[PDB]
Amino acid sequence: RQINTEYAVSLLEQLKLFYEQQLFTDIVLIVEGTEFPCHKMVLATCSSYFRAMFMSGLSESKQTHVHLRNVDAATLQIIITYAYTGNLAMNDSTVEQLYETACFLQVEDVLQRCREYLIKKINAENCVRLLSFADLFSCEELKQSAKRMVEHKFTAVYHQDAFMQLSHDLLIDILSSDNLNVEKEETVREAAMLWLEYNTESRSQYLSSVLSQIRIDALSEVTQRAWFQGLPPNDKSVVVQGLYKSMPKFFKPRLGMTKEEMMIFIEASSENPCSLYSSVCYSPQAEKVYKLCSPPADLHKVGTVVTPDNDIYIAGGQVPLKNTFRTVNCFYWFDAQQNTWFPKTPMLFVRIKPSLVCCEGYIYAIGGDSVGGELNRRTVERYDTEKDEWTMVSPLPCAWQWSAAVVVHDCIYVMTLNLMYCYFPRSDSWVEMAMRQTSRSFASAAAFGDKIFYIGGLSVTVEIYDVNKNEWKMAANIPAKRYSDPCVRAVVISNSLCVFMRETHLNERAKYVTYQYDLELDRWSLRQHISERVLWDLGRDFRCTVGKLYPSCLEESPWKP
Amino acid sequence: MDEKYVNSIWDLLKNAIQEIQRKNNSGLSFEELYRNAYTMVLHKHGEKLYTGLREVVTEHLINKVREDVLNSLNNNFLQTLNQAWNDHQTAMVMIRDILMYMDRVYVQQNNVENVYNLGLIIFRDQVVRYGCIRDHLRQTLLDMIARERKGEVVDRGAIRNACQMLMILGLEGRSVYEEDFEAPFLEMSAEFFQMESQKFL
C-alpha cells in the first residue's frame, strides 16, 4: 500500500532537497557544456530511456560523466525538475522542444501531458505546424485532431506559409480525404497548384500524384495549360502519364459542398419523458427536421452565437445539482462533422442565459446574470477566438435584464426595454444611441443588413432602426390570429429578412409557419408553412439561430407525423 | 538526408550489434547507438532497419548456434542448447531495449510483432524447429525421461530449464511447446504404461 500522507510527500521533498544540495549524486549529465548532477533512481523511474541507459550492461553504465547530445539544456532541466517534484509548469512556446526531448528520453507521463496540452491548443494557426510535428513524431491523437482542424480551417485559408513545407504522405492524406470544408472544387485545385508552383522540378512525380489526387473535376479546367507553361524541357512520358488522368479514378462528389443554410434550435420539447430538453434543426430548403446532441446532456439555459465562419458556440447555463439548478460557466463548441461538443476555456463568471455576440473575430458575451451581486452590476466580458482567453472590457452603462444584442457594421449593439448603447471595439467605450418610444421586454433582435429589427415584446411590435439614420420607426403588424400569444423569431435567411413565428390559442394546437418580409412593402408574405407532419412542438424557451450544417454527419429526428 | 549517411549509420549499427552478439558488450557505447536509432527512425526508414535487423539476427543464428548445436549433438547437447539460449536472451536484452525504443513507434504504426518476439520467432524457426535438431532433441529427451522412469536418477533441473525455454519460445502461450513436447512424450508414456500394466496384471 502506498501511504500518501506521511512518507510520499516527505520522501519527494527530501529527494528534491538532496538534488538542490548536490547530495548523494552519482551521475551527471553533460549538455553542450552544462552540468546537471542528478540521481540514477529518479531518472530510471521517470524516463524509460535512462533505465536502459543505467541498467543495460555497456560502457556508459559504469560512467560517472555522460555526454548526452541532441537535447536542449532548458528542456532537460525542466524534465529533471518535473521528475524531482511532479510539477511540469509548461509554457505555450517551448512545447515543441519539450515534446521532442520527452520523446527522445521516452518519459511517458510528460509525453502524455504535452500531448494533451497540444491537442487542447490547436486554435487557428499552428494547426498545420503541429500536424507536421505529429507526422514527424508519431502521435495518433495529435495526428487525428490536427487532421480534423486542418480539414476545417485550411479549406478556408489554404495560404499558410507552414503548409508549403509538408511531406508527400501527409499532403496526400489531407487532399484525398473527404472531409474538406470547401463549398467549391476549384479552391483545392489552386491550393494544390500553388503547393506545386513554389517547388517545381523537384517534386514532379509528387506533382503527378497530387494531380491524380485532385481528380478530373478540377483536372480538366486549367492544369494542363499551366503545366505546359511550367514543364521541364525534353519531357515526353510525363505528357503520357498526365493525359491518362481523365477517365479513371472514381469521380465522386465531395462533402464540403453540403453547407446547407439551416436553423439551429435549442431546448426543444423532448420526446422521451426521461429527458427535459433537446436541440434540433430545421431545413428551409430540404423541408426536414434534423437533431443535434446536447452539449452537456444535462445543463440547460444556454446562449448561442454564430460567427461569420459558420461556427457554433455554447456558453453559460444552469444544471440541476442532482442532490441525492446550479450555474456553471463552462464553454463548448460544436463539431461540424463529428456531431459532438469539444469544451473550451471556461468563463470567469457563472452566467444565466448569456448573450454572445461575434465581432472582429471576437466573441462578446453581454449580460446574462454575471454574478448578480457585483459592485457594478452592469458589466460584460468578451472572448478571444485566437488567443483562447477572456479579456475584461468596459462595463455596461445601465443594468438590464432580458436584453438582446446584435452586431452591425462591425459594431456592438445591445437592445433593452427602451435604451440602446453602441460599444466601440476600437476605443472600448459605450456611446448613447436612440431611445425607443415603446417599453417592451422579453424580445430579441436580428441584424439583417444595416438595419436592426426589434420584433416582439410585452407582441407584434415591429420597430426598425437604422445605423446610418439613427432613428426608430414602425413598419406594420405581422398578420396573426386573434386571441393568441405569438412567439416571434427574427433571423436572416438567404440574404433575405424573414421571421419564424408560432401561434397558440385556447384548446388549440400550435402551428409553425415562416413568412417572407419585404423592406419597401412592410408586409410578411406567406413564404412557407411548416407542416406538423415533420416538425413537432418546440416549447417556450427555445432559441433560433442561422448556421450551415452537414446532413450526413447529423441524423434525422424520428417522430410520428 | 542523403542515402549515404543513413547507409553508414546502419552499417555502424550492424557492426555494433554483431560486436554485442559476440560477447563483447563491455567496450561499446550506448548513447551513440540510441542517438543513431533516433535519427534512423525519425527519417521514416523503419522498414529498412527492421529488415536489416531480421537479416543480421538470422544470419548470426545460422552461422553460430546452428553450427554449434550440430557440432555437439552428443557431447552435452542439451547443456550447449541451454547455454546458447541464455546467450541469445542476454544479448536480446539490450537488442530489445534499443529496438524497442524503435518498436514503440514501429509497432504502434506498422502493426507487427516486437523485436523480442521477432527474435523468439526466428530462434524457434532456425534452431528448435530445424530439420535435424528437432528430431534429435525429441529423441534424446524421450530417452532420458524413459531412463529416469526405469529407476535410475538423472539430471532433473536441466529438463525444467528446457521446458521453461520451450514455454518462453511459445511466445503466446502453450501452442508450440505443448505439441512438440507432450505429443511424442504422450505416445511414449502411453506405450510404457500399457506395457507396465500388462506386466503387472
- Smallest CA–CA distance, residue B80 to chain A, in Å, is 24
Residues 6+ apart with CB under 8 A from A351: A315, A316, A327, A329, A365, A367, A368, A369, A370
Cα distance between residue A500 and residue A498, in whole Å = 7
Cα distance between residue A112 and residue A60, in whole Å = 28
Cα distance between residue A177 and residue A215, in whole Å = 12
Cα distance between residue A63 and residue A78, in whole Å = 23
Identify which of A59, A68, A136 has the shortest CB distance to residue B42.
A136
If DSSP codes are grouped into helix, strand and coil, which group holds residue A372?
coil
- The x, y and z cell numbers of residue A355, run together, are 448573450
Q: Are A198 and A164 in contact (CB under 8 A)?
A: yes
Cα distance between residue A184 and residue A203, in whole Å = 26
Q: Are A329 and A350 in contact (CB under 8 A)?
A: yes
Burial classification of residue A308, based on how many CB atoms lie within 10 Å of its CB (0-12 exposed, 13-18 middle, 19 or more buried): exposed
Residue A59 and residue B27: Cβ atoms within 8 Å? Answer: yes
Task: Look at chain A and count its residues.
Answer: 561
Cα distance between residue A462 and residue A477, in whole Å = 7
Residue A60 and residue B31: Cβ atoms within 8 Å? Answer: yes
Residue A59 and residue B42: Cβ atoms within 8 Å? Answer: no
- The x, y and z cell numbers of residue A264, run together, are 439551429
Resolution in A: 4.0
Q: Write out chain B residues lying below 8 Å of A62, CB-based.
A: none
- Considering only CB atoms, which residues of chain B are within 8 Å of chain A? 25-31, 34-35, 38, 42, 93-94, 97-98, 101, 104-105, 108-109
Amino acid type, A187: T
Distance of CA A356 to the CA centre of its chain: 14
Experimental method for this entry? cryo-EM
Identify which of B29, B42, B93 has the shortest CB distance to residue A60.
B29
Q: Are A115 and A103 in contact (CB under 8 A)?
A: no
Nearest to A158 by CA among A176, A143, A180, A136: A180
Residue A106 and residue B104: Cβ atoms within 8 Å? Answer: yes
Distance of CA A22 to the CA centre of its chain: 48
Cα distance between residue A43 and residue A196, in whole Å = 47
Q: Which CATH number is A260-556 given?
A: 2.120.10.80
- The x, y and z cell numbers of residue B105, run together, are 513507434
Query: Could you tell me which chain A residue has the CA closest to the CA of B105?
Result: A138
Element (H, E) at A424: strand A420-424
